[PDB]
Amino acid sequence: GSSGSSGKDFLAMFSPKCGGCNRPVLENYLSAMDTVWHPECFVCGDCFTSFSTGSFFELDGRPFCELHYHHRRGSGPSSG
Ligand SMILES: [Zn+2]
Ligand SMILES: [Zn+2]
């Protein structure tokens, strides 16, 4: 009449992870919003376009493209 069990495998990694797949980025990784991302995931939220052409924009901690990024700021709900 005695049971018990200890010893599990928890997050054994401190390094950051893409803000989309939650994977440990090492090579060919980006650094946005004080975090890391993937050169394939890091894209807009609406049009979901790559940020290769130019630079991206941070809107409430979310990757967006000038096109939308701006549209949202104006005609639409926005906070300051
Ligand atoms: Zn990713
Ligand atoms: Zn967009």
Side-chain angles (χ1 to χ4, degrees):
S2 178
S3 54
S5 199
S6 285
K8 277 90 84 69
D9 48 287
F10 290 118
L11 193 80
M13 57 204 80
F14 91 98
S15 308
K17 304 174 149 186
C18 155
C21 324
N22 304 269
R23 275 276 204 85
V25 275
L26 312 84
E27 49 70 65
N28 211 308
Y29 79 93
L30 321 80
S31 270
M33 305 162 183
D34 201 28
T35 193
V36 304
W37 299 82
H38 271 143
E40 65 181 23
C41 324
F42 202 54
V43 306
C44 189
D46 290 27
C47 64
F48 283 103
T49 191
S50 171
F51 297 112
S52 207
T53 50
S55 192
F56 90 123
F57 302 66
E58 175 198 321
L59 199 82
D60 205 48
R62 286 280 91 156
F64 290 116
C65 78
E66 197 189 327
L67 191 87
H68 277 123
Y69 165 81
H70 281 260
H71 204 252
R72 273 182 85 84
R73 276 184 60 74
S75 64
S78 286
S79 296

